[PDB]
Nucleic acid binder design. Structure first.
Ligand code: D3T
Ligand code: MG
Ligand code: MG
Ligand code: MG
Lengths: 698, 105
DNA sequence: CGACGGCCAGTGCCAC
DNA sequence: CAGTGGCACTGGCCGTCGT
């Protein structure tokens, strides 16, 4: 087993030079440094470990180092280099599995101070190396008089870089050993730093194998990217911007501008009593300036001539209140609230901080006598929505337009095990929160992401898209876990036609979507009122619905009790929280991992969401594996390409309709394989759609 | 004896008043504005004949002030034939106001 | 002196 | 007592940096 890390001149997208590398071999118990001209030797050392049936450990190598080396090897040495997946270990992947209850900076992309909870020390260190290196580099320069530029610390190799490269490996080695010491994932009787790769995967908890296969596959998806229609979104941006302008124009005509105090430093005090009046706006008492200027001659200084006027504008001792001119901002809940109360609106609900609540719910309910302002409310709602679309598509820091790469695709990032339950998180930009086709502007947004927007490298023919989504996944998970209480009764009923459509009807809900947000809110503990809000009624309708669905399948109560009995010993509320005494504060996931439980109440959600998450994870893995065994190649220079994984759905680009048909059929085979693999008590299914883009494939 | 202005009457009462008009831009929520208010009432009398004192509440009339770049209140603008003759910001005293007025009238 | 940016709570809505 | 996440925008606050 060896531990390694590299230093290159840029992120994967544009890296073109290997600066250095370090390798720690467990067999020799020694570190070896490779400088820029030692690149070939470095690569040879990695392949020697592979040929030996050994293992290579990197910290974030799955997403960076491994692919980076393949790229650099081709550019610099015109060499083919491809470390096999089974020979690689990623301490970041391991750390995100074992310490899943914790957050991380995603390797310095997120400011540590903005994250909640604690951070694993070694990982924190590794994640901050680039930042600390840059700081070191920057001061050294300023100690030499030379200026600092953009990010010159990565343009050339230097010995500080080398030392850091070395530090990474020693820290990564410590992290590795810290993770390997967890008896839950790694059996104590085996020294995992001294076994071949086959032993490493087979002797460790299944979860370890699943996480690494997920990370390796998802890294590839990131490299593939999602074909994006830049032109269509820019045109949408224009249309949205125009609509926003018109709304602003009308709204600013309806709601006039006003002045607010701003810039005041001194406290205003009663001129008679001298009592400070904190509630009055801060003021400013100029210390210089008078009505006239200082006398510049005899009979001026002797009060005989006029004496020059002080054009200034202030007078010493004459206090005033500094103000600013503010224009109505439809995006300011504060401005909306101000103008509406000034119109007679009497706020009913406020935030747990005093401010009145101004969401779409209350806006829709607001009533004022002036018909023009009453009408302005709709304009405000539309404006707020237009902003969300504009922000997500063009103006936000994470806007799609700011992320489109040269290859005409958006390479969204994925943290394979970013959520506590085992789900992935998505960001930069979050491809898992694209507006749905049924919401305003949804179709345009959705259609902009699609295989059609990718022209084949050889024929120039647009690719086709295969969308597959697990059918009512979390409800089937529920059926599985409560089969021991109802003998698979629900597991059989759920297959009788679409479960959500069935519920929609029984609940008398408008849409199948509403039924979903209803059943899950219900299943996971929403209150009577919370349910009422979801269906559009009150706490009254809430109770009816909850009792009607709980009556239908009382086993839900049974499952909820056993989970409680298993996790909780006793609990009680102190003030604004419920202090709990735990028997065990984690659930054993489907693949054996510990799944941290945040609260006794969210427990059932932890159990079911985790199960669905691990099922889908194994699902995308087996699916790609079954395709590869069928001779299909994964890539734009091949037959298919993973473009996105959104919890229980995958969107895959295919070179032909035939392949898309096979991707869809294979996905279904893989899901059934997963179900059989974990002896699931509920049959698992998927629904697939072939089409040009995401609007049609979901 | 003071003239209470509105945005719509500002043009004719001030810009076309032909004579010296002292406009006070104020707001009910300003400490200094409440201070100078009584001073203005007395000034209105004394200077009756050679000066007209008008007030414009910037809250009730949000359209005029902006045109004059109001940055602080109370703001005292002295108009003469539609032109701003002199400007002064702050709660001046009875004496200081008189001084300011006599020097510009 | 004050415009402006990185950091931050508050609030809300998007998706699964 | 729905749950898991990302992220945009307003308004505070404060330190760097040009008027
Ligand atoms: C929408 C939504 C979803 N969830 C969870 C639990 C389910 C999974 C997958 O959602 P999906 O819409 O595919 O639902 P699914 O049952 O898979 O429906 P399909 O058959 O795919 O339509 O996400 C939730 O907790 N709250 C929600 O409001
Ligand atoms: Mg590294
Ligand atoms: Mg689904
Ligand atoms: Mg889905």
């Amino acid at each position: 087993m060896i531990v390694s890390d590299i230093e290159a001149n840029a992120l994967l997208e544009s890296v073109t030079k290997f600066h250095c590398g370090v390798i720690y071999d467990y067999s020799t118990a020694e570190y070896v440094s490779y400088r820029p001209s030692d690149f070939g030797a470095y690569l040879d050392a990695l392949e020697a470990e592979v040929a030996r049936g050994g293992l290579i450990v990197f910290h974030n190598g799955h997403k960076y180092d491994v692919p980076a080396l393949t790229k650099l090897a081709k550019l610099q040495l015109n060499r083919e280099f491809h470390l096999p997946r089974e020979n690689c270990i990623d301490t970041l992947v391991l750390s995100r599995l074992i310490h899943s209850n914790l957050k991380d900076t995603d390797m310095g992309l997120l400011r540590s101070g903005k994250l909640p909870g604690a951070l694993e020390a070694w990982g924190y260190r590794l994640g901050e190396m680039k930042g600390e290196y840059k700081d070191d580099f920057k001061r050294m320069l300023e100690e030499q008089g030379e200026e600092y530029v953009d990010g010159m610390e990565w343009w050339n190799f230097n010995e500080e870089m080398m030392d850091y490269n070395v530090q990474d490996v020693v820290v990564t080695k410590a992290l590795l050993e810290k993770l390997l010491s967890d008896k839950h994932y790694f059996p104590p009787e085996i020294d995992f730093t001294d076994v071949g790769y086959t032993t490493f995967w087979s002797e460790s908890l299944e979860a370890v194998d699943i996480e690494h296969r997920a990370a390796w596959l998802l890294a590839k998806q990131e490299r593939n990217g999602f074909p994006f229609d830049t032109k269509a979104i820019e045109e949408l941006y224009v249309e949205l911007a125009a609509r926003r302008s018109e709304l602003l124009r009308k709204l600013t005509e309806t709601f006039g501008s006003w002045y607010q105090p701003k810039g005041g430093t001194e406290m205003f005090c009663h001129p008679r009593t001298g009592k400070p009046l904190p509630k009055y706006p801060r003021i400013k008492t100029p210390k210089v300036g008078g009505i006239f200027k200082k006398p510049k001659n005899k009979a001026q200084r002797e009060g005989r001539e006029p004496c020059e006027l002080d054009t200034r504008e202030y007078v010493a001792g004459a206090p005033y209140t500094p103000v600013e001119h503010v224009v109505f901002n439809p995006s300011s809940r504060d401005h909306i609230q101000k103008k509406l109360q000034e119109a007679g609106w009497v706020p009913t609900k406020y935030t747990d901080k005093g401010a009145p609540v101004v969401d779409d719910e209350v806006l829709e309910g607001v009533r004022v006598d002036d018909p023009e302002k009453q009408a302005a409310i709709d304009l405000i709602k539309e404006y707020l929505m237009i902003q969300k679309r504009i922000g997500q598509s063009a103006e936000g820091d994470k806007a799609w337009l700011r992320y489109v790469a040269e290859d005409g695709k958006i390479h969204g990032s994925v943290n394979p095990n970013g959520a506590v339950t085992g789900r992935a998180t998505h960001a930069f930009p979050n491809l898992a929160q694209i507006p749905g086709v049924r919401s305003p502007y949804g179709e345009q947004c959705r259609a902009a992401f699609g295989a059609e927007h990718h022209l084949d490298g050889i024929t120039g023919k647009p690719w086709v898209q295969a969308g597959i989504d697990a059918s009512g996944l979390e409800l089937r998970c529920l059926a599985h876990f409560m089969a021991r209480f109802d003998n698979g009764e629900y597991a059989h009923e759920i297959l009788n036609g679409d479960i959500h459509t069935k519920n929609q009807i029984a609940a008398e809900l408008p849409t199948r979507d509403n039924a979903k947000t209803f059943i899950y809110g219900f299943l996971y503990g929403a209150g009577d009122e919370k349910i009422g809000q979801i269906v559009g009624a009150g706490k009254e309708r809430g109770k009816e619905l909850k009792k009607k669905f709980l009556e239908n399948t009382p086993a839900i109560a049974a499952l909820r009790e056993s989970i409680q009995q298993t996790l909780v010993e006793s609990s009680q509320w102190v003030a604004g929280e419920q202090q709990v005494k735990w028997k065990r504060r984690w659930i054993k996931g489907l693949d054996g991992r510990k799944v941290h439980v945040r609260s006794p109440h969210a427990a059932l959600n932890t159990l079911l969401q985790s199960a669905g998450a691990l099922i889908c994870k194994l699902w995308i893995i087996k699916t790609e594996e079954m395709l590869v065994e069928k001779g299909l190649k994964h890539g734009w220079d091949g037959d298919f390409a993973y473009m996105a994984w959104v919890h229980d759905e995958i969107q895959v680009g295919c070179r032909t309709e035939e392949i898309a048909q096979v991707v869809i059929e294979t996905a279904q085979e893989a899901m059934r394989w997963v179900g059989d693999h974990w002896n699931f008590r509920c049959l698992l299914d998927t629904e697939g759609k072939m089409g040009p883009n995401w609007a049609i494939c979901h | 004896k003071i003239i209470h202005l509105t945005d719509d009457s500002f043009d004719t009462d001030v810009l076309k008043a032909d004579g010296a008009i002292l406009v006070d831009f104020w707001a009910e929520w300003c400490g200094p504005c409440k201070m100078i208010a009584p001073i203005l009432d007395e000034i209105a009398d004394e200077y009756q004949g050679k000066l007209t004192v008008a007030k414009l509440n910037i809250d009730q009339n949000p359209g005029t002030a902006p045109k004059y770049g109001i940055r602080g209140i109370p703001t005292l603008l002295l108009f003469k034939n539609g032109e701003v003759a002199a400007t002064k910001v702050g709660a001046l005293s009875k004496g200081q106001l008189k001084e300011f007025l006599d020097a510009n009238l």
